[PDB]
Design a binder for these strands. Structure first.
Ligand SMILES: [Cl-]
Ligand SMILES: [Mg+2]
Ligand code: NA
Ligand code: NA
Length: 326
DNA sequence: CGGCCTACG
DNA sequence: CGTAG
DNA sequence: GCCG
């Protein structure tokens, strides 16, 4: 009664197993910091299964037959049900390695590989990194300067204000172009740590060259604190009462023929999209990305006019964005 | 055992 | 290497 | 870590 891929079941934003899923996600995150992508995936998938259940897990028996629950994930749940805490999870949380890898990987421009090297060199705090700016890229410098602001989530009201400024710039860059809110806010989140916009134009081809024109206009308005094409990873000035704060904004352009695929990809969740691409290839023999859906036997691309089309192509029941919170 | 999403900057 | 979801 |  629980399908094995996250894209085969609705997953709402809020659910009935929050504590259990959060603990499994700690172990997933820690597996990522050690470079164990397989373990990360399993713990992420197990957490997601609990998010999709219709009521709380209260007894170990209720895990029987659920996909992605084996000896390890079941033991974690069992300990939480019996004692309210899982010793393995708590040991991770307190560990110097987990806490430092988490802090460093939060920096825009720092991934697991860079964080781990710094950890191995003995660095532990943000002020440690500031004292040696010779080891920092310009991107990492911006990420470190703006880290505090970027650590606080923004509200949907902020997002709506940002969308108006983006729409103004896009309208001058290319009249008729449109701006769509994607990412977690499209899935229903009321607050989140970045904001994502997808830009297209109804006349195929007109969007060529658009992103540089948009960026120049936003820069000219004084709104761009940092930027580096079709994807732009920016830090924007967001107005706040009497002041402002830095916010991470991603801008993406797609031709209208690809828009459904780009909308689907950029709406997430990350696990949902990895699972959907895995399902596509392994179960359907079709190759999915944010540009299209390829049949490698006929050597053809599916045309889609909507996300609904893509779900139909793949033989999946349609899930609205609010149900893609895997 | 092999596999684990698939791109762009 | 980083980024995205 | 789990699935097929
Ligand atoms: Cl692994
Ligand atoms: Mg986002
Ligand atoms: Na980072
Ligand atoms: Na983003």
């Amino acid at each position: 009664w629980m399908p094995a891929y996250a894209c085969q079941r609705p997953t709402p934003l809020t659910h009935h197993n929050t504590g259990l899923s959060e603990a499994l996600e700690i172990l997933a995150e820690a597996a990522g910091f050690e470079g164990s992508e397989g373990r990360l995936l399993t713990f992420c998938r197990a957490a997601s299964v609990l998010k999709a259940l219709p009521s709380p897990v209260t007894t170990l028996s209720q895990l029987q037959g659920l996909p992605h629950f084996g000896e390890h994930s079941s033991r974690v749940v069992q300990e939480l049900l019996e004692h309210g805490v899982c010793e393995e999870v708590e040991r991770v949380r307190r560990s110097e390695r987990y806490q430092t890898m988490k802090l460093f990987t939060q920096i825009f421009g720092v991934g697991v590989k860079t964080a781990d090297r710094w950890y191995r060199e003995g660095l532990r705090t943000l002020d440690d990194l500031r004292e040696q700016p010779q080891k920092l890229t310009q991107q990492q410098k911006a990420g470190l300067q703006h880290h505090q602001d970027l650590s606080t989530p923004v509200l949907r009201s902020d997002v709506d204000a940002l969308q108006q400024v983006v729409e103004e710039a896009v309208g001058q860059a290319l009249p008729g172009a449109t701006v769509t809110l994607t990412g977690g806010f499209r899935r229903g989140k009321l607050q989140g740590h970045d904001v994502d916009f997808l830009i297209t134009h109804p006349k195929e081809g007109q969007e060529a060259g658009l992103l540089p024109r948009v960026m120049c206009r936003l820069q000219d308005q004084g709104l761009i604190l940092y930027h580096q094409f079709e994807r732009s990873f920016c830090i924007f000035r967001l107005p706040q009462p009497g002041s402002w704060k830095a916010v991470r904004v991603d801008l993406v352009v797609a031709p209208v023929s690809q828009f459904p695929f780009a909308l689907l990809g950029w709406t997430g969740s990350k696990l949902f999209q990895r699972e959907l691409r895995r399902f596509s290839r392994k179960e359907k023999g079709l190759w999915l990305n944010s540009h299209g859906l390829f049949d490698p036997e006929q050597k053809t691309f599916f045309q889609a006019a909507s996300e609904e089309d893509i779900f139909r192509h793949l033989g999946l029941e349609y899930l609205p964005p609010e149900q893609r919170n895997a």
